[PDB]
């Protein structure tokens, strides 16, 4: 089932970011999603993976740091800068 | 009943601290907490001795600054390090 380990991802900076964010570093998976083609949607990934984690963390610090973890804010801000930009790209960026 | 007077005290900070916070003397009190052993506990006994001190002031800037002593805060925020540290060591800190 496994491909093969000698193959380059297909996808390297979702699989990056994705592993970044399932361990709460915040800093390396932002700077991840900053090199990601999709940035919108790995930005809305990353916000429900936190606000899932958030219930699961043990430390209170983690978990308040899960709960600011403002990646929607991130989706919010690039697609303010998209509809400001084209407004005719950006719903098909939506859909 | 007194003890030796060539005797050193058993717990110096804990009386300088005490002695300082007697005389409404905040700046130097708060030296003497900042180098004793335990400090949530001297921050409370200050708190508590600072309103209980505020009633039985006569000068209005003197009760003034009494009501401000927040030693309360001092509590509050050293805890608050300890707890987001630990937070298994803050529990038996507590108790």
Chains 1, 2 share one sequence.
Not at 45 to 55: R, S
Not at 74 to 80: I, K, R, T
Request: proline share 3%; hydrophobic share 45%; glycine share 2%.
């Amino acid at each position: 089932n496994l491909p093969d380990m000698d193959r380059r991802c297909e996808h390297p900076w979702r699989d990056l970011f994705l592993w970044a964010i399932l361990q709460n570093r915040q800093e390396m998976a932002n700077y991840f999603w900053a090199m990601g083609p999709e940035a919108v949607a790995a930005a809305l990934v990353g916000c429900k993976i936190m606000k899932e984690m958030a219930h699961l963390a043990t430390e209170a610090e983690s978990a308040r740091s899960m709960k600011n973890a403002k990646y929607e804010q991130f989706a919010m801000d690039l697609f303010s800068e998209c509809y400001s930009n084209s407004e005719d790209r950006a719903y098909s960026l939506l859909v």
